[PDB]
RNA sequence: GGCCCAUUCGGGUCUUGUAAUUGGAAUGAGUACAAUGUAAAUACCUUAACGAGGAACAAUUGGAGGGCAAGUCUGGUGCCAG
RNA sequence: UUGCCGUUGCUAUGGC
């Protein structure tokens, strides 16, 4: 059973966003399991599962803890506006390939 | 003078480091971080709460309604209580039984509701340290802890298990073993208004759990003897005390760092301090804690000390040397075996082998001005801490509790200026860890409740 | 390289029982006797100058 | 396993160096692409063939 | 590290024989490394003695040196004098390593059993599994050397030999 | 590659953002990317500070001015629409840009040092300031180094602060950069080290230039609010 | 029976050996699920599955000394010396 | 008011 801890929750009205640091705790598990972590984050906060996102995962030595960077949006459309395209390729729906020449 | 030169050179050093009040006094980085402080959320859990309940001299002391409800369980060990924002209490014994009480009928003795008794039936069929997932206690339940929300009680003892029982039925919902051979739990404390438990296990270890997720958060290491007591408040700090290493540590649990506080009273300098014009001495083992607020706490020792410690001083702020008396010396008909009283008196060596009572229970009411100490002197003591927070002082005594006090905690009633509390104290005739206790002087295994007023 | 020094130290401390007399740990059980002989002619003590 | 690619690379280079002079050229060709080898690799292979400085034999 | 002056005299060879056999060392490089940095330590403490009382260097670097030597654990709490740093020597330093300490605490039956426990990761001081044998445990990490909870000598699930024998005996 | 005024942490990058041209100089301003991204941290990178600049939250000096490297110099009131953010940024005592938070009736104006008064063309009196607000028609008694108060809805001067002996002055320049206290001394030389001198906690003395100092109010009553500690 | 000293005779000492049998535990190199990381990929970190008896899953380098044949060569005062 | 047992109160105590 994974365990979740949010810390230092601030609000960004300019980016319509709420951001925090994510202490993810998995004793006798491998690692963070980021999609399941987005599920757990989207249910501890409000619904917006295609508007919650995590990117900066570092597991400490020997496992157990990992610190990530969590940012949760309202309004999935403006989340699609404000998130970068590589994270949208990683998690959500966007896929535009670069033209392979030279 | 070498220490004078050390102090002088350290002062010059700090002056030089400063080298490398006006009308304008504003610093850009400080005010930017204060803008981020105005931007952030969650001013809820992390209150550095000071002492906001100044009521020590206010309430009455000497005429409490003291009911010592004796129960038929050998050597009660712990007491857990609960208040929402009807009140239940919990006791547990060395006879492997948990017992639920109702306590909310305030003017009278508590009411038994439900047993939950483990026994020899719950010994595991493996003797293997990770299939310890049975549903009951087979050895020596040492501590209970009620949830701050009241869905669960969680208990554990020398069978190295944490069994979490439901409140409404006293049923084991989940079993979490501590996965090693010496992993006996000795103290449990929820952080206040939460679902997070801090257990202190004799592996020099502190385990943390989230109870409603059935998960373990963090194991944190660092004491040097068994972590005999634990204490927590609404902050994610914690305060533990290991027994014989004579240090109390407090843990930033997310950072996994600590502040250590050693003791350090010596009878040489103490008897010289009295010699400038006396039966007091060094320290055995720091035993019990309770975090009074988020800047101070208090420790109960093995030589009867009660000490008051701040968050900003390694050495303690205040001591109180003898807090429950010195024990009655062993009789001349039970020391020597000679015939004459002169030689049987010579076998007492005067005052050299008088040992003090050791405080085996201490409870600070959270953020309040008053704490309660208990041992087998027969009389609980009530002390209030002065409003400048650099001393405490004995208010009164509660003399209706014959036996060892294995647990003290209080139950609140009344509003902001008019209040009444019932002090529960588990009374046994045997210390909560080993036996060690002779001269059982009229003790009974009961619950000493007192109703204090105003 | 580790097992070689484990087994040339065991050889060395078996040779040390030959040159000196090594304190083995005192009297084990009942004092049975000297088990190897007593020489009344040999004196293994260091004379001065 | 690029790890085992590098390991077997080094082992083949050393075993080849015990059979030819110590400091002969072992060349590494990648996978075949469209019927023949990558022309970058064949270009600098021909660069290795172009400077070889032959020494006269006896028979 | 650095090699000694006369590296092949018979006293030095019997010295290294006794040290490597009594502490389970693999070669001479363990002794030479720990003795090289001990040489730096007490070559510094010699100069701290050759300067006088109430010298600033002597006062501050002397109590700094003896306090971090006490916290490494080679020097006891009561001898807070600077000549004990000169009396210090090499096996006082390699009694502090984790192989020696695992054997002395009795989690292993010899120093070689301790070395293979450490390199097979059954030993964790504090939180982390330590896996190199020459670790130099400190006076606060002296009492949390225990079996790792990820290991069958702790309380964990038994290893591949035990479970394969159990499966084949179940067949 | 950075200046000292920006309060810029060294563990940031390699290329430092040159501000673009604008009202103030390069050496006495901070752009919006070093303002929003890495000082009060409304962004995390250049992409999203360009995103909120395209969204147009910024309202510096009452106009939007959507640009990354827009050189906000002295006391340009940065206005942000969400959470009614009104920021007047001044100098602290050790050279950086202390960004004080103010309210709406204070961000409804700014002040500016007058640089020169001209009979430019066609009989029109004329005034410039450090953001270059060429506003029409002040009184004839506008000397150099006095202080106009800009309207910030239109552009007109609303109030005027005369530079003389006994006025509350702000020093931006040289080795006195960012001090307040304005009275130990007055000394006007004839070409250099000419000034009004500024006190300290023990009322110490200081030397600067005329152009490196400019007035903000009176002895106890500036209508600018100032941060404290 | 091993070991130690000593130019010699000899002396000192003591649980020591053996390609003897045998037992269950341990895991690491390797083989590999992944997830994390990252524009992407590698690598680090975390990590289920398999992985040892010649544990052949087969580390070297250099030194000291022998001993053997229906063998070969040389010398010469048998059977010897080299 | 309890594992027994005694005084019990018509509730408090004290021996294992």
mmCIF file of N, CA and C in Angstrom, chain B residues 21-36 38-39, chain F residues 7 39-42 91-93 96 98-99 180 199-201 227-229:
data_model
loop_
_atom_site.group_PDB
_atom_site.id
_atom_site.type_symbol
_atom_site.label_atom_id
_atom_site.label_comp_id
_atom_site.label_asym_id
_atom_site.label_seq_id
_atom_site.Cartn_x
_atom_site.Cartn_y
_atom_site.Cartn_z
ATOM 1 N N UNK B 21 19.323 51.054 15.737
ATOM 2 C CA UNK B 21 18.393 50.543 14.739
ATOM 3 C C UNK B 21 17.842 51.686 13.896
ATOM 4 N N UNK B 22 18.142 51.639 12.601
ATOM 5 C CA UNK B 22 17.886 52.735 11.676
ATOM 6 C C UNK B 22 16.387 52.855 11.382
ATOM 7 N N UNK B 23 16.013 53.949 10.712
ATOM 8 C CA UNK B 23 14.609 54.171 10.377
ATOM 9 C C UNK B 23 14.151 53.266 9.237
ATOM 10 N N UNK B 24 15.018 52.995 8.269
ATOM 11 C CA UNK B 24 14.753 52.001 7.237
ATOM 12 C C UNK B 24 15.469 50.699 7.579
ATOM 13 N N UNK B 25 14.692 49.627 7.712
ATOM 14 C CA UNK B 25 15.217 48.361 8.198
ATOM 15 C C UNK B 25 14.659 47.169 7.432
ATOM 16 N N UNK B 26 14.458 47.298 6.127
ATOM 17 C CA UNK B 26 13.779 46.264 5.361
ATOM 18 C C UNK B 26 14.766 45.498 4.492
ATOM 19 N N UNK B 27 14.613 44.176 4.479
ATOM 20 C CA UNK B 27 15.495 43.277 3.748
ATOM 21 C C UNK B 27 14.698 42.557 2.673
ATOM 22 N N UNK B 28 15.242 42.575 1.451
ATOM 23 C CA UNK B 28 14.496 42.193 0.256
ATOM 24 C C UNK B 28 14.145 40.711 0.253
ATOM 25 N N UNK B 29 15.104 39.852 0.604
ATOM 26 C CA UNK B 29 14.841 38.422 0.608
ATOM 27 C C UNK B 29 13.870 38.001 1.689
ATOM 28 N N UNK B 30 13.931 38.661 2.847
ATOM 29 C CA UNK B 30 12.990 38.378 3.922
ATOM 30 C C UNK B 30 11.575 38.773 3.526
ATOM 31 N N UNK B 31 11.411 39.951 2.915
ATOM 32 C CA UNK B 31 10.059 40.345 2.527
ATOM 33 C C UNK B 31 9.552 39.562 1.314
ATOM 34 N N UNK B 32 10.446 39.062 0.454
ATOM 35 C CA UNK B 32 10.008 38.188 -0.636
ATOM 36 C C UNK B 32 9.522 36.843 -0.112
ATOM 37 N N UNK B 33 10.268 36.255 0.829
ATOM 38 C CA UNK B 33 9.812 35.029 1.471
ATOM 39 C C UNK B 33 8.528 35.256 2.263
ATOM 40 N N UNK B 34 8.336 36.460 2.805
ATOM 41 C CA UNK B 34 7.069 36.761 3.460
ATOM 42 C C UNK B 34 5.928 36.920 2.457
ATOM 43 N N UNK B 35 6.231 37.334 1.223
ATOM 44 C CA UNK B 35 5.209 37.340 0.177
ATOM 45 C C UNK B 35 4.806 35.913 -0.186
ATOM 46 N N UNK B 36 5.781 35.006 -0.257
ATOM 47 C CA UNK B 36 5.471 33.587 -0.478
ATOM 48 C C UNK B 36 4.683 33.015 0.703
ATOM 49 N N UNK B 38 2.571 34.777 2.529
ATOM 50 C CA UNK B 38 1.214 35.242 2.278
ATOM 51 C C UNK B 38 0.545 34.474 1.146
ATOM 52 N N UNK B 39 1.330 33.902 0.236
ATOM 53 C CA UNK B 39 0.761 33.160 -0.882
ATOM 54 C C UNK B 39 0.356 31.740 -0.508
ATOM 55 N N UNK F 7 18.937 40.314 -6.940
ATOM 56 C CA UNK F 7 18.867 39.218 -5.968
ATOM 57 C C UNK F 7 18.687 37.883 -6.688
ATOM 58 N N UNK F 39 12.009 35.552 -8.555
ATOM 59 C CA UNK F 39 12.085 36.357 -7.346
ATOM 60 C C UNK F 39 10.877 36.186 -6.442
ATOM 61 N N UNK F 40 9.666 36.403 -6.945
ATOM 62 C CA UNK F 40 8.478 36.076 -6.169
ATOM 63 C C UNK F 40 7.745 34.880 -6.750
ATOM 64 N N UNK F 41 8.304 34.262 -7.793
ATOM 65 C CA UNK F 41 8.089 32.853 -8.122
ATOM 66 C C UNK F 41 6.640 32.550 -8.504
ATOM 67 N N UNK F 42 6.105 33.344 -9.420
ATOM 68 C CA UNK F 42 4.826 33.024 -10.026
ATOM 69 C C UNK F 42 4.974 32.121 -11.233
ATOM 70 N N UNK F 91 14.543 50.337 -3.590
ATOM 71 C CA UNK F 91 15.854 49.810 -3.251
ATOM 72 C C UNK F 91 15.911 49.512 -1.762
ATOM 73 N N UNK F 92 16.585 48.426 -1.397
ATOM 74 C CA UNK F 92 16.832 48.160 0.010
ATOM 75 C C UNK F 92 18.134 48.847 0.412
ATOM 76 N N UNK F 93 18.658 48.506 1.589
ATOM 77 C CA UNK F 93 19.851 49.190 2.076
ATOM 78 C C UNK F 93 21.146 48.559 1.598
ATOM 79 N N UNK F 96 19.822 45.809 -3.514
ATOM 80 C CA UNK F 96 18.943 44.946 -4.285
ATOM 81 C C UNK F 96 17.625 45.667 -4.554
ATOM 82 N N UNK F 98 14.116 45.645 -3.415
ATOM 83 C CA UNK F 98 13.106 45.218 -2.459
ATOM 84 C C UNK F 98 11.734 45.556 -3.014
ATOM 85 N N UNK F 99 10.910 44.545 -3.252
ATOM 86 C CA UNK F 99 9.595 44.752 -3.845
ATOM 87 C C UNK F 99 8.556 44.754 -2.721
ATOM 88 N N UNK F 180 18.101 55.967 3.377
ATOM 89 C CA UNK F 180 17.026 56.883 3.746
ATOM 90 C C UNK F 180 17.377 57.526 5.082
ATOM 91 N N UNK F 199 21.359 60.522 7.264
ATOM 92 C CA UNK F 199 21.699 60.006 8.582
ATOM 93 C C UNK F 199 21.707 58.479 8.612
ATOM 94 N N UNK F 200 22.013 57.938 9.789
ATOM 95 C CA UNK F 200 22.009 56.507 10.074
ATOM 96 C C UNK F 200 21.352 56.302 11.436
ATOM 97 N N UNK F 201 21.494 55.092 11.984
ATOM 98 C CA UNK F 201 20.970 54.812 13.318
ATOM 99 C C UNK F 201 21.691 55.637 14.377
ATOM 100 N N UNK F 227 8.384 49.596 3.173
ATOM 101 C CA UNK F 227 8.484 48.350 3.939
ATOM 102 C C UNK F 227 9.325 48.541 5.192
ATOM 103 N N UNK F 228 9.243 47.555 6.079
ATOM 104 C CA UNK F 228 9.956 47.613 7.342
ATOM 105 C C UNK F 228 10.442 46.215 7.700
ATOM 106 N N UNK F 229 11.125 46.122 8.836
ATOM 107 C CA UNK F 229 11.583 44.851 9.362
ATOM 108 C C UNK F 229 11.434 44.782 10.867
#
